């Protein structure tokens, strides 16, 4: 019947960004920042040159929403712009409709998680008696930040095991290098195994319940039994990372931790973790 296309102005002049979809594929989408105008045209193409198409209105929407997987039908839209493009009538010929949303709120970064998703899109809808012809084009949003000593964390019993991990920042951008050192200051118990992890914690809070998903992004092992310091360098740019996302519209958080892990000879596990705020540096 109809083929609806959504075409952005300055299409081939604007930046695209890679973003992983719920499946696992990484597609490229038009990248927008907070505030930016979103404009273009909704293109209608009559499959049958020779045939009207009746409708109860054509409209374009800019929507920003949070979708919780434990409540999948119930979208939480945080920004909705609606611009009606046509009154009910009929299309008797392929044609396009201009649209512009000036000043578009996009407070949060796009996120495709484990129990939750935050996406922006344009939706063009042709209302009809039977079923609406609906067309959605996702667009991706990024949030840039700008920022400016030593941070320490330690693990193990009292007299018999004291390990100290020291690193340069409490904040890192997504291409940064975590520069630190492991100090073995006391080792009366044999150490069977030790590692530094970077962990992504996704916290989704849907209804009375909160769900929690830990994802180990990077696992850096500390070798062979002769524990002196050992310098640590974790290269963030090698990993799939997103900025820290704190309490996004009180629906979910994505936070990152350095997780110090120590397994002794009696097989006792010693854990310590500390939050590092990730952020996106503007290119």
From Swiss-Prot:
Subunit structure and binding partners: Component of the heterotrimeric retromer cargo-selective complex (CSC), also described as vacuolar protein sorting subcomplex (VPS), formed by VPS26 (VPS26A or VPS26B), VPS29 and VPS35. The CSC has a highly elongated structure with VPS26 and VPS29 binding independently at opposite distal ends of VPS35 as central platform. The CSC is believed to associate with variable sorting nexins to form functionally distinct retromer complex variants.
Tissue/organ expression: Ubiquitously expressed in developing embryo and adult. Highly expressed in brain.
Keyword Hydrolase: no
InterPro entries reported in the protein's UniProt record: Arrestin-like_C, Vps26-related
Cell compartment(s), UniProt: Cytoplasm; Membrane; Early endosome; Late endosome
Protein family (similarity comment): Belongs to the VPS26 family.
One GO term describing the cellular component: retromer complex
Name under which the protein is recorded: Vacuolar protein sorting-associated protein 26B
Impact reported for residue 231 to S: Disrupts interaction with VPS35:VPS29 dimer; no endosomal localization
Keywords for this protein: Cytoplasm, Endosome, Membrane, Phosphoprotein, Protein transport, Transport
This protein's record includes keyword Protein transport: yes
One of the protein's GO biological processes: intracellular protein transport
Organism, scientific name: Mus musculus (Mouse)
């Amino acid at each position: 019947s109809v083929e609806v296309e959504i075409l952005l102005n300055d299409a081939e002049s604007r930046k695209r960004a890679e973003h992983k979809t719920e499946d696992g594929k990484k597609e490229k989408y038009f990248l927008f920042y907070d505030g930016e105008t979103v404009s273009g045209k909704v293109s209608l193409s009559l499959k049958n040159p020779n045939k009207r198409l009746e409708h109860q209105g054509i409209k374009i929407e800019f929507i920003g929403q949070i979708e919780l997987y434990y409540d999948r039908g119930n979208h939480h839209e945080f920004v909705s712009l609606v611009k009606d493009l046509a009154r009910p009538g009929e299309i008797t010929q392929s044609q396009a409709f201009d649209f512009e949303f000036t000043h578009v709120e996009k407070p949060y970064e796009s996120y495709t998680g484990q129990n939750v998703k935050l996406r922006y899109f344009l939706r063009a809808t042709i209302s009809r008696r039977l079923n609406d012809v609906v067309k959605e084009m996702d667009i991706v949003v990024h949030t840039l930040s700008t920022y400016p000593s030593s941070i320490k964390m330690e693990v193990g019993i009292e007299d018999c095991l004291h390990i100290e991990f020291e690193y340069n920042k409490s904040k890192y951008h997504l291409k940064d290098v975590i520069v630190g050192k492991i100090y073995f200051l006391s080792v009366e118990i044999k150490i069977k195994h030790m590692e530094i992890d970077i962990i992504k914690r996704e916290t989704t809070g849907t209804g009375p319940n909160v769900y929690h998903e830990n994802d180990t992004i990077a696992k850096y092992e500390i070798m062979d039994g002769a524990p002196e310091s050992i310098p640590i360098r974790l290269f963030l740019a090698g990993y799939e990372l997103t900025p820290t996302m704190r309490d996004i519209n009180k629906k979910f958080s994505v936070r990152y931790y350095l997780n110090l892990v120590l397994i002794d000879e009696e097989e006792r596990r010693y854990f310590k973790q500390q939050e590092v705020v990730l952020w996106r540096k503007g290119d």
